[PDB]
Amino acid sequence: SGFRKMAFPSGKVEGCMVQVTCGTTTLNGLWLDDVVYCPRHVICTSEDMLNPNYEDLLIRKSNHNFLVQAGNVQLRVIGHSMQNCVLKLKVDTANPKTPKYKFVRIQPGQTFSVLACYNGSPSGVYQCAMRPNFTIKGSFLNGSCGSVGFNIDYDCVSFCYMHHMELPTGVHAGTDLEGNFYGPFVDRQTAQAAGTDTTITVNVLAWLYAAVINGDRWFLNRFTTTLNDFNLVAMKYNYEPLTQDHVDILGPLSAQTGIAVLDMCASLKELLQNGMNGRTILGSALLEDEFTPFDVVRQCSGVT
Amino acid sequence: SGFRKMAFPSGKVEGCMVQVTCGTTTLNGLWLDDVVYCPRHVICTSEDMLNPNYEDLLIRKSNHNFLVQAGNVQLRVIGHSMQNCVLKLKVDTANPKTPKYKFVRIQPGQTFSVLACYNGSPSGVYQCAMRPNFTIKGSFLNGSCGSVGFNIDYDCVSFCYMHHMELPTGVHAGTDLEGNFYGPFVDRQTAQAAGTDTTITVNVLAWLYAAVINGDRWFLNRFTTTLNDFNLVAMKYNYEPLTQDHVDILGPLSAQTGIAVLDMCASLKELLQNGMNGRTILGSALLEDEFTPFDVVRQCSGVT
Ligand SMILES: COc1ccccc1O[C@H](C)CNC(=O)c1cc(=O)[nH]c2ccc(F)cc12
Ligand SMILES: COc1ccccc1O[C@H](C)CNC(=O)c1cc(=O)[nH]c2ccc(F)cc12
C-alpha cells in the first residue's frame, strides 16, 4: 500500500547523457547509437536568442565546433544536421550503453519521467505530465536544456521530451526527439504565454481509484451522474471534458474496485463543488492529475 | 525555476539489485562487493512471521538454500550470517557494478530516494523522508522487501534504508544497512502502531524558502516571532520544535532570499493559524515537509 509520484528507474537514460558545447554555450545531449541529439539553440549566444535564424547560424558551424563529452572522454563529431528544433550530431562511436529505444510523441495528459541534467551529468529524476496547454511543470535551471523525458516498458525506453526552454511564467516547453515542439512554442526568447492549464480529468479519476485501492474512501458518495452532467461541472472547473474513450480506459480500475466510472465521476463532482473541507486524499489537499490510469495500475500491481 | 519532489538518479543502485529466494519466499537483495544484503525475514514462511525465532529458523538453512540471481545469472553463495535484522550472503563474485558507497543511519526528518524493486528488478524511484515516528510513507507491495533508500553525493551512494514491512496502518518500517530498525519496530507480524506523525518544521521552512526563490510569495507577511513563541504554535499543530540548530541550517536559504529565519517562522505561524484559504504554494495545498534545507539548496543550484 501507499501511493507516490513515482518516476521510472533512470539508469538506462543516465548511460545516454552527454555534454554538448558549441562556442560558449553548454547543454545536455542524448547519445543513442552513433547520434547525439541536442536542442539546436546550443549554437546561439544569449543575444542570438532574441531573434535567431538557425539555418544562418548553423552555416558558421562545422563538426569540430560541437564539443561532445561522455563522462570524461571526448567524442569525435563526424557529421551534423538540423531536424526541426534539434541537432543530430553524428559521432564516430556508438554508445555502448544504448538501451532498446523508441522516439514517441505524447498526447497532453500523458505522464513521463524527467532526468534533469547539467553538463551531461544527472542531477535528479521526477515525474511530469504534458499539460493540456502543452507545457510541463518541471524543475529546470540554466544548463538543463537537452534533459529528456521518457517512459520505460520493461527494457525499452520511449523518449518523448527534450527540454528547450522556460517561459516567462516559470513553466517549461520542449520538443519530442524529432525536434517538434509540443504546443505552439518556438525556440526564441519572445512573449510566449501559455493557454489555460486545465485539469486532466481522466488522471484525477485514476488517482481517486488509486485512493480507494489504498484505503482512502471518505470521498465516496451515494451519487451517480452522466457523462454530459459531469462535463457541465468539469467545464465550470476548467477540467478537460471526459469522453467514452476515457471511461473505457478507466474500465480495469472500475473492475478492480467495483466502483462504476460514473459513480466515481459523481464523487469527483461533489469534490469539485464542495471542496476537500480541510481533508486529504493520498496525502494531498488538492485533486492530483499527473497519474494516468496506466500509472495507477502499474504502481498498484508492481510492473518492473 | 519550478520545484519538484526529485529523487536521485537511480542507476548506481539499479546495478546492485538482485533477487533472493529462500524456500518459497522471494525478495530483493543489495549486492555490494561480494556481499548480498537482504531482510532476514526471507527465511520465514507466512506462518513463521507471527512469532519467528530467527536464530532457530536460520539453523535449518545452508548456503545452497539462498538462491541469488543477478539479472538472469545465478550467484554462488559461499557464506551467510545474520547481522541484527539483515542477512549478509557472501557470494563468490564481487559486483562489477558496485559504486562507491557508505552505510549511514539517518535521523528523522532526513530525506532519501527509494528504488522500489520486485524480484530483483527496479519498478520505480521516489523521494521519501524518515518520519519523526520512524516510519516512512512509501509505495510498497508484496515482494518489495529488500528495496533500499539512499542519498548520492556526486559518485558516493550512502545507503540508509532497507524495506522490511508494512504496518497495519499502511505506513512502512525498515532498517539501516546494519539491520537495525528505525524506531521501535520489529520484524514480526504483530500489533505495531506508529506514534504521532508530527510535521518536520525545518523542512517546511526550507520549502517556504524554495517557494520564495521560485516566485510564490503571497504567504510572506509583515510579522516576525521568536523561537519560543513559534514553538508554542508548532506544539499546538503537532509540528516538531524548532531549535537554534535548525535556524543555523536555514542560514544559507535566509541569506539567499534576504528573509530572516524568524520572519519565515512568522509566515509559517500565520499559515498554521489561518490555513491556505484555498490557495497553493509550489502547486501544493498543504505545507510540504519532505524537502530538507540541503535538498532545497541542491535543487535550486543544480548539484549533479
Ligand atoms: C528564454 O530562453 C530561451 C528561449 C527560447 C529557447 C531557449 C531558451 O533558453 C536558453 C537558450 C537557455 N535556457 C536555459 O538554460 C534555462 C532553461 C530552463 O528551463 N530554466 C532556466 C532557468 C534559469 C536560466 F538562467 C536559464 C534556464
Ligand atoms: C506483516 O508482514 C511483516 C511483518 C513484519 C516483517 C515483515 C513482514 O512482511 C512480510 C515478510 C512480507 N511483506 C511484504 O512483502 C509487503 C511489504 C510491504 O511494504 N507491503 C506489502 C503489501 C502487500 C503485501 F501482500 C505484502 C507487503
XYZ file of C-alpha atoms and ligand atoms in Angstrom:
662
model
C 0.000 0.000 0.000
C 0.915 3.683 -0.268
C 0.846 5.856 -3.368
C 3.739 8.000 -4.543
C 4.627 10.221 -7.509
C 6.998 7.597 -8.839
C 9.430 8.057 -11.694
C 10.882 5.256 -13.844
C 14.340 3.948 -12.811
C 16.708 6.317 -14.649
C 19.818 4.155 -15.215
C 19.095 3.355 -18.868
C 18.812 7.109 -19.600
C 21.812 8.108 -17.391
C 24.017 5.991 -19.678
C 22.966 8.209 -22.637
C 23.600 11.652 -21.149
C 26.457 13.635 -22.623
C 27.621 17.254 -22.550
C 27.447 19.339 -25.742
C 29.279 22.650 -26.062
C 29.246 24.978 -29.025
C 31.215 28.189 -28.557
C 30.394 29.419 -25.067
C 27.062 27.526 -24.693
C 26.997 24.167 -22.866
C 23.911 21.976 -22.594
C 22.940 18.286 -22.477
C 22.799 15.862 -25.341
C 21.274 12.403 -25.683
C 23.665 9.808 -27.139
C 21.876 6.863 -28.831
C 23.787 4.631 -31.241
C 26.204 6.991 -33.122
C 23.992 10.089 -32.854
C 23.897 12.769 -30.184
C 20.581 14.725 -30.046
C 20.501 18.189 -28.512
C 18.485 21.452 -28.740
C 19.537 23.485 -31.778
C 19.744 26.598 -29.562
C 23.195 25.241 -28.450
C 24.548 27.267 -31.465
C 23.078 30.511 -30.085
C 24.658 33.175 -27.971
C 22.236 34.840 -25.445
C 21.994 37.785 -27.926
C 21.034 35.384 -30.780
C 18.080 34.010 -28.732
C 16.077 37.238 -29.213
C 15.598 36.584 -32.965
C 17.687 33.594 -34.172
C 17.906 32.459 -37.811
C 19.008 28.908 -37.123
C 19.866 27.984 -40.730
C 22.127 31.082 -40.987
C 23.704 30.483 -37.573
C 24.362 26.843 -38.461
C 26.323 27.782 -41.660
C 29.087 29.230 -39.445
C 29.411 25.888 -37.564
C 31.485 22.862 -38.547
C 31.710 19.349 -36.993
C 34.749 20.420 -34.882
C 32.761 23.311 -33.307
C 30.474 20.819 -31.464
C 32.313 19.513 -28.411
C 30.718 16.308 -27.133
C 31.943 14.811 -23.905
C 30.670 11.497 -22.468
C 31.843 11.392 -18.867
C 35.466 12.480 -19.057
C 36.073 11.374 -22.685
C 35.643 13.317 -25.915
C 33.514 12.027 -28.786
C 34.529 12.712 -32.360
C 31.836 14.564 -34.354
C 31.792 13.340 -37.973
C 28.517 14.921 -39.124
C 25.819 17.351 -38.078
C 22.327 18.130 -39.238
C 19.320 20.088 -38.047
C 15.976 18.281 -37.773
C 13.245 20.767 -36.815
C 14.474 22.245 -33.424
C 17.085 19.562 -32.612
C 20.623 18.984 -33.837
C 21.752 15.450 -34.628
C 25.484 15.141 -34.177
C 26.851 12.019 -35.798
C 29.757 10.680 -33.742
C 32.319 8.017 -34.700
C 31.423 5.779 -31.715
C 28.138 4.032 -30.999
C 27.089 4.496 -27.348
C 27.875 1.114 -25.756
C 25.183 1.839 -23.124
C 22.426 2.446 -25.739
C 19.273 0.782 -24.417
C 16.410 -0.505 -26.621
C 14.593 2.700 -27.529
C 11.863 4.442 -29.473
C 11.007 8.093 -30.090
C 7.366 8.792 -29.283
C 5.322 11.992 -29.456
C 2.959 12.034 -26.479
C -0.544 13.446 -26.156
C -1.487 16.006 -23.455
C -2.405 14.316 -20.172
C 0.284 11.651 -20.644
C 2.948 11.362 -17.970
C 6.690 10.743 -18.191
C 9.839 10.822 -16.081
C 12.445 13.595 -16.495
C 16.126 13.081 -15.768
C 17.311 16.623 -15.044
C 20.951 17.014 -16.130
C 23.628 19.706 -16.010
C 26.899 19.500 -18.032
C 25.964 15.962 -19.191
C 25.540 14.823 -15.560
C 22.311 13.603 -13.931
C 21.075 15.706 -11.012
C 17.692 14.105 -10.356
C 14.610 12.330 -11.571
C 10.971 13.309 -11.247
C 7.579 12.551 -12.751
C 5.886 15.063 -15.119
C 2.774 15.270 -17.277
C 2.316 17.000 -20.611
C -0.220 19.674 -19.658
C -3.297 20.232 -21.891
C -1.699 23.623 -22.852
C 1.475 21.676 -23.982
C 3.743 22.946 -21.231
C 5.267 20.855 -18.436
C 5.713 21.976 -14.849
C 9.310 20.904 -14.373
C 12.298 21.841 -12.278
C 14.915 23.203 -14.647
C 17.727 25.707 -14.135
C 20.308 27.186 -16.590
C 22.204 24.371 -18.300
C 19.284 21.862 -18.031
C 18.401 22.126 -21.754
C 18.693 18.827 -23.555
C 17.474 16.931 -20.409
C 14.927 14.337 -21.617
C 11.522 12.894 -20.711
C 10.847 9.203 -21.133
C 8.714 6.194 -20.284
C 10.073 2.621 -19.875
C 8.280 -0.576 -20.939
C 10.352 -3.427 -19.345
C 13.648 -2.829 -21.286
C 12.521 -0.327 -23.967
C 12.952 3.402 -23.288
C 10.428 5.557 -25.180
C 11.910 9.059 -25.273
C 9.144 11.638 -25.533
C 10.541 15.010 -24.456
C 13.693 17.112 -24.712
C 13.845 20.278 -22.637
C 14.341 23.545 -24.532
C 13.029 26.484 -22.562
C 11.364 28.196 -19.689
C 8.514 30.589 -20.451
C 8.391 33.896 -18.509
C 5.669 32.299 -16.321
C 8.037 29.597 -14.949
C 6.530 26.729 -16.965
C 8.533 24.624 -19.390
C 8.459 23.938 -23.144
C 10.265 21.461 -25.296
C 10.177 19.118 -28.195
C 9.758 15.422 -28.961
C 13.020 13.683 -30.185
C 12.236 14.640 -33.813
C 12.658 18.306 -32.729
C 8.979 19.269 -32.992
C 7.787 21.450 -30.085
C 4.815 20.355 -28.069
C 2.282 23.140 -28.487
C 2.790 26.428 -30.266
C 6.118 27.296 -28.644
C 9.160 28.394 -30.588
C 12.853 28.358 -29.580
C 13.062 32.119 -29.405
C 13.254 34.474 -26.381
C 9.949 36.205 -27.010
C 6.456 36.744 -25.483
C 5.063 33.242 -25.379
C 2.171 32.894 -22.992
C 0.666 29.525 -22.208
C -3.037 28.814 -22.633
C -5.395 27.611 -19.908
C -3.866 24.939 -17.734
C -6.932 22.749 -17.439
C -7.053 19.695 -15.146
C -6.605 16.215 -16.686
C -9.934 14.712 -15.604
C -9.228 11.066 -16.545
C -5.994 11.249 -14.457
C -7.839 12.677 -11.430
C -10.353 9.778 -11.637
C -7.490 7.277 -11.961
C -5.963 8.848 -8.811
C -9.339 8.619 -6.966
C -9.375 4.893 -7.892
C -5.763 4.629 -6.511
C -7.010 6.281 -3.279
C -9.865 3.744 -2.891
C -7.400 0.837 -3.532
C -5.091 2.263 -0.844
C -7.836 2.799 1.786
C -8.781 6.482 1.432
C -12.538 6.233 0.850
C -14.134 9.226 2.673
C -14.965 10.985 -0.636
C -17.109 8.107 -1.948
C -20.706 9.247 -2.001
C -24.214 7.842 -2.598
C -24.499 9.510 -6.031
C -24.056 8.846 -9.708
C -24.082 11.160 -12.763
C -23.933 11.018 -16.612
C -21.035 11.980 -18.926
C -22.977 15.080 -20.045
C -23.914 16.183 -16.477
C -20.358 15.541 -15.220
C -18.932 17.503 -18.182
C -21.086 20.553 -17.371
C -19.349 20.598 -13.924
C -15.931 19.795 -15.486
C -16.284 22.806 -17.854
C -17.132 25.082 -14.906
C -13.964 23.982 -13.067
C -11.574 24.050 -16.077
C -11.355 20.275 -16.173
C -10.925 18.517 -19.513
C -14.149 17.017 -20.920
C -14.467 13.306 -20.129
C -15.123 11.106 -23.164
C -16.323 7.492 -23.517
C -12.668 6.729 -24.516
C -11.612 7.895 -21.007
C -14.413 5.804 -19.377
C -13.126 2.748 -21.341
C -9.534 3.388 -20.262
C -10.784 3.510 -16.593
C -12.517 0.092 -17.097
C -9.878 -2.028 -15.316
C -9.776 0.357 -12.292
C -13.552 0.296 -12.185
C -13.478 -3.534 -12.279
C -10.831 -3.800 -9.550
C -12.640 -1.548 -7.077
C -16.224 -2.379 -8.101
C -16.947 1.362 -8.403
C -18.609 2.278 -11.726
C -16.799 5.092 -13.595
C -19.891 7.356 -13.494
C -20.186 6.850 -9.708
C -16.542 7.951 -9.348
C -17.438 10.922 -11.602
C -20.226 11.833 -9.113
C -17.708 11.674 -6.241
C -15.386 13.924 -8.257
C -18.318 16.299 -8.977
C -19.085 16.687 -5.249
C -15.364 17.216 -4.530
C -15.264 19.987 -7.137
C -18.457 21.609 -5.830
C -17.805 21.265 -2.075
C -14.008 21.157 -1.855
C -11.996 18.878 0.437
C -13.218 20.600 3.684
C -9.664 20.553 5.097
C -9.324 16.812 4.422
C -6.689 14.958 2.359
C -6.668 12.195 -0.297
C -3.487 10.120 -0.578
C -1.686 12.807 1.473
C -2.754 15.594 -0.924
C -5.072 18.532 -0.213
C -5.817 19.010 -3.944
C -7.009 16.696 -6.736
C -3.863 15.187 -8.317
C -3.886 14.879 -12.114
C -0.378 13.675 -13.011
C -1.075 9.899 -12.682
C -2.595 8.261 -15.777
C -4.905 5.205 -15.423
C -1.894 3.159 -16.703
C 0.371 4.605 -13.947
C -2.180 3.720 -11.235
C -2.453 0.107 -12.483
C 1.355 -0.148 -12.877
C 2.082 1.189 -9.375
C -0.724 -0.806 -7.772
C 0.460 -4.106 -9.490
C 4.275 -3.724 -9.397
C 5.359 -3.744 -13.062
C 9.183 -3.790 -13.272
C 12.568 27.648 -11.914
C 9.985 25.108 -10.755
C 10.166 22.858 -7.715
C 9.613 19.111 -7.790
C 9.810 16.148 -5.403
C 13.001 14.964 -7.042
C 14.721 11.661 -6.404
C 18.421 10.934 -7.005
C 19.299 9.274 -10.353
C 18.900 5.556 -9.567
C 21.369 3.899 -11.979
C 24.117 3.313 -9.407
C 21.593 1.481 -7.176
C 19.888 -0.406 -10.077
C 23.243 -2.095 -10.758
C 23.165 -3.540 -7.197
C 19.660 -5.018 -7.152
C 19.410 -8.786 -7.070
C 16.704 -11.348 -6.319
C 16.995 -13.513 -3.190
C 14.862 -16.618 -2.709
C 14.844 -18.911 0.281
C 12.328 -21.748 0.105
C 9.127 -20.225 -1.238
C 9.910 -16.586 -0.250
C 11.411 -14.211 -2.844
C 12.523 -10.668 -2.063
C 15.196 -8.144 -3.088
C 18.813 -8.099 -2.080
C 21.508 -5.441 -2.362
C 24.756 -6.707 -3.917
C 27.835 -4.644 -2.914
C 31.312 -6.103 -3.381
C 30.955 -9.872 -2.599
C 28.063 -9.475 -0.142
C 24.330 -9.536 -0.769
C 22.254 -7.799 1.973
C 18.605 -8.710 2.429
C 15.912 -8.749 5.171
C 16.322 -11.783 7.429
C 12.572 -12.470 7.105
C 13.439 -14.069 3.687
C 13.882 -17.325 5.743
C 10.303 -17.112 7.059
C 7.158 -18.705 5.780
C 3.980 -16.536 6.244
C 3.157 -18.752 9.293
C 6.635 -18.074 10.804
C 6.046 -14.275 10.647
C 3.537 -14.414 13.537
C 6.265 -15.299 16.089
C 9.628 -16.042 14.384
C 12.760 -17.201 16.235
C 15.268 -16.123 13.618
C 18.307 -17.866 15.146
C 16.362 -21.180 15.234
C 14.972 -20.709 11.720
C 18.447 -19.900 10.402
C 19.937 -23.201 11.758
C 17.845 -25.109 9.184
C 19.356 -23.023 6.324
C 22.607 -23.643 4.463
C 24.436 -21.536 1.813
C 22.741 -23.528 -1.016
C 19.246 -22.665 0.337
C 19.748 -18.951 -0.554
C 19.167 -18.506 -4.279
C 20.667 -15.237 -5.506
C 20.042 -14.150 -9.054
C 21.577 -11.015 -10.630
C 19.630 -10.381 -13.819
C 19.405 -13.795 -15.443
C 22.563 -15.267 -13.825
C 22.952 -17.182 -10.573
C 25.409 -16.116 -7.877
C 27.193 -18.717 -5.797
C 26.583 -18.307 -2.040
C 29.736 -19.213 -0.081
C 28.742 -17.871 3.349
C 25.829 -16.459 5.299
C 25.437 -14.579 8.533
C 22.761 -12.646 10.376
C 23.536 -9.080 11.473
C 20.628 -7.706 13.526
C 17.582 -7.939 11.105
C 19.549 -8.390 7.849
C 21.243 -11.395 6.281
C 24.642 -10.962 4.654
C 25.133 -13.543 1.948
C 28.749 -13.834 0.909
C 28.951 -14.622 -2.806
C 31.973 -15.782 -4.829
C 31.777 -12.796 -7.232
C 32.244 -9.120 -6.443
C 29.512 -6.995 -8.075
C 31.293 -5.371 -11.038
C 28.747 -2.509 -10.874
C 29.478 -1.729 -7.177
C 29.530 2.058 -6.843
C 31.474 3.973 -4.149
C 29.270 3.521 -1.093
C 28.710 4.032 2.607
C 26.115 2.744 5.066
C 24.566 5.598 7.030
C 21.887 5.633 9.725
C 19.709 8.699 9.172
C 17.919 10.911 11.675
C 14.143 11.582 11.494
C 13.335 14.454 9.132
C 16.081 13.398 6.703
C 15.052 12.567 3.155
C 16.195 9.842 0.769
C 15.291 8.226 -2.540
C 13.744 4.728 -2.692
C 14.220 2.396 -5.637
C 11.179 0.124 -5.372
C 12.046 -3.353 -6.692
C 10.247 -6.645 -7.280
C 12.098 -9.946 -7.992
C 15.434 -8.053 -8.116
C 14.054 -5.678 -10.783
C 13.561 -1.910 -10.426
C 9.968 -0.707 -10.766
C 10.344 2.953 -9.817
C 12.038 5.678 -7.860
C 10.565 8.199 -5.456
C 11.596 10.573 -2.691
C 10.839 9.739 0.985
C 11.554 11.173 4.423
C 12.169 9.335 7.673
C 9.146 10.468 9.688
C 9.638 11.681 13.302
C 7.799 8.454 14.391
C 10.453 6.410 12.409
C 8.105 5.195 9.702
C 8.250 6.144 6.015
C 5.253 6.769 3.790
C 6.305 4.659 0.832
C 4.717 2.763 -2.010
C 5.463 -0.902 -1.437
C 3.592 -4.050 -2.451
C 4.294 -7.777 -1.749
C 7.799 -8.660 -2.923
C 9.184 -5.100 -2.372
C 11.121 -6.086 0.788
C 14.834 -5.529 0.451
C 14.228 -2.383 -1.721
C 16.631 0.309 -0.436
C 16.729 4.017 0.424
C 19.773 6.086 -0.419
C 21.305 9.506 -0.947
C 24.037 10.279 -3.540
C 26.929 12.723 -3.063
C 28.476 13.096 -6.589
C 29.653 9.435 -7.036
C 29.174 8.033 -3.497
C 25.909 6.244 -2.664
C 25.025 6.423 1.048
C 22.555 3.597 1.668
C 20.311 4.448 4.603
C 17.219 2.237 4.431
C 16.176 -1.309 3.560
C 12.462 -2.036 3.388
C 11.135 -4.735 5.727
C 7.456 -4.256 6.421
C 4.136 -2.555 6.209
C 2.332 -1.762 9.456
C -1.449 -2.395 9.599
C -1.917 1.385 9.113
C -0.310 1.366 5.619
C 2.945 3.036 6.702
C 6.346 1.442 6.242
C 9.157 0.254 8.535
C 12.655 -0.900 7.855
C 16.237 -0.949 8.889
C 19.530 0.778 8.120
C 22.091 -1.469 6.235
C 23.443 -2.815 9.560
C 19.979 -4.399 10.099
C 18.871 -2.083 12.918
C 15.231 -0.956 12.592
C 14.442 2.714 12.583
C 12.166 3.221 15.570
C 10.754 0.553 17.831
C 9.556 -1.773 15.072
C 10.309 -5.470 14.990
C 10.241 -7.917 12.045
C 7.228 -9.757 13.367
C 3.575 -9.743 12.192
C 2.142 -8.230 15.350
C 0.302 -5.117 16.672
C 2.777 -2.356 15.989
C 1.189 1.058 15.994
C 3.131 4.129 14.976
C 3.425 7.173 17.221
C 2.375 10.710 16.316
C 3.351 11.666 12.805
C 4.451 15.203 13.559
C 5.423 17.675 10.813
C 9.140 18.303 10.129
C 9.188 22.052 10.798
C 12.707 22.806 9.484
C 11.747 21.066 6.181
C 8.530 23.103 5.858
C 10.566 26.329 6.319
C 13.118 25.123 3.752
C 10.188 24.513 1.351
C 8.770 28.024 2.066
C 12.237 29.400 1.160
C 12.109 27.279 -2.082
C 8.677 28.831 -2.815
C 10.021 32.402 -2.396
C 13.026 31.564 -4.676
C 10.601 30.218 -7.302
C 8.196 33.208 -7.182
C 5.403 32.084 -4.832
C 5.424 34.891 -2.255
C 1.753 35.503 -1.267
C 2.278 33.954 2.206
C 5.023 36.421 3.196
C 3.660 38.677 5.897
C 4.628 41.820 7.851
C 5.376 39.836 11.037
C 8.195 38.266 12.972
C 8.245 35.936 16.014
C 10.720 34.281 18.462
C 11.785 30.606 18.660
C 9.773 30.213 21.890
C 6.609 31.919 20.512
C 6.844 29.965 17.231
C 7.315 26.704 19.180
C 4.138 27.304 21.216
C 2.248 27.364 17.851
C 4.306 24.417 16.489
C 3.346 22.305 19.557
C -0.344 23.136 19.032
C -0.160 21.942 15.404
C 1.954 18.789 16.009
C 4.992 20.335 14.367
C 8.458 19.425 15.626
C 10.033 22.054 17.913
C 12.404 24.359 16.026
C 15.877 24.631 17.557
C 18.746 27.103 17.020
C 20.462 24.187 15.150
C 17.564 24.283 12.625
C 17.812 28.123 12.359
C 21.573 27.722 11.627
C 20.921 25.069 8.978
C 18.417 27.517 7.314
C 21.148 30.251 7.284
C 22.090 29.920 3.592
C 18.401 29.990 2.483
C 17.853 33.012 4.684
C 20.911 34.697 3.106
C 19.830 33.893 -0.458
C 16.312 35.288 -0.088
C 17.081 38.046 2.440
C 14.243 36.743 4.643
C 15.317 36.229 8.280
C 14.512 32.728 9.612
C 12.249 34.130 12.371
C 10.298 36.174 9.784
C 9.730 32.966 7.781
C 8.658 31.343 11.086
C 6.039 34.134 11.483
C 4.768 33.440 7.946
C 4.565 29.738 8.831
C 2.737 30.622 12.092
C 0.056 32.594 10.204
C -0.272 29.743 7.674
C -0.834 27.288 10.528
C -3.344 29.571 12.266
C -5.271 30.787 9.191
C -4.787 27.965 6.686
C -4.121 28.410 2.963
C -7.614 29.916 2.234
C -7.938 27.752 -0.903
C -4.559 28.946 -2.214
C -1.485 26.892 -3.199
C 2.292 27.055 -2.570
C 4.530 25.420 -5.182
C 1.436 23.618 -6.544
C 0.569 22.155 -3.114
C -2.483 22.893 -0.958
C -0.690 21.698 2.214
C 2.650 22.542 3.860
C 5.232 20.129 2.382
C 7.781 18.707 4.830
C 9.760 16.154 2.798
C 12.410 18.594 1.426
C 15.360 19.253 3.758
C 17.206 22.626 3.652
C 20.006 20.694 1.829
C 17.516 19.401 -0.807
C 16.198 22.935 -1.453
C 19.741 24.310 -1.951
C 20.714 21.291 -4.110
C 17.640 21.561 -6.359
C 17.828 25.349 -6.564
C 21.617 25.244 -7.501
C 21.797 22.126 -9.727
C 24.196 19.762 -7.922
C 24.897 16.710 -10.127
C 14.457 32.460 -22.776
O 15.328 31.372 -23.077
C 15.066 30.628 -24.196
C 14.075 30.922 -25.125
C 13.794 30.018 -26.137
C 14.517 28.846 -26.255
C 15.538 28.557 -25.364
C 15.810 29.431 -24.319
O 16.650 29.097 -23.280
C 18.068 29.424 -23.337
C 18.692 29.030 -24.651
C 18.755 28.600 -22.207
N 17.794 28.255 -21.165
C 18.164 27.668 -20.029
O 19.306 27.261 -19.837
C 17.130 27.587 -18.966
C 16.169 26.627 -19.039
C 15.198 26.425 -18.016
O 14.226 25.683 -18.138
N 15.329 27.213 -16.902
C 16.283 28.218 -16.757
C 16.346 28.977 -15.592
C 17.292 29.981 -15.464
C 18.138 30.216 -16.515
F 19.110 31.155 -16.368
C 18.103 29.509 -17.689
C 17.188 28.464 -17.804
C 3.121 -8.242 8.187
O 4.276 -8.541 7.406
C 5.502 -8.457 8.011
C 5.699 -8.207 9.363
C 6.981 -7.988 9.841
C 8.069 -8.057 8.992
C 7.896 -8.349 7.648
C 6.616 -8.531 7.142
O 6.362 -8.599 5.790
C 6.340 -9.882 5.101
C 7.535 -10.733 5.445
C 6.392 -9.564 3.577
N 5.892 -8.219 3.315
C 5.710 -7.761 2.078
O 6.072 -8.383 1.084
C 4.981 -6.473 1.956
C 5.640 -5.306 2.191
C 5.039 -4.028 2.007
O 5.556 -2.973 2.372
N 3.764 -4.032 1.504
C 3.024 -5.184 1.245
C 1.731 -5.101 0.736
C 1.003 -6.253 0.492
C 1.578 -7.462 0.784
F 0.891 -8.596 0.485
C 2.840 -7.595 1.304
C 3.598 -6.442 1.503
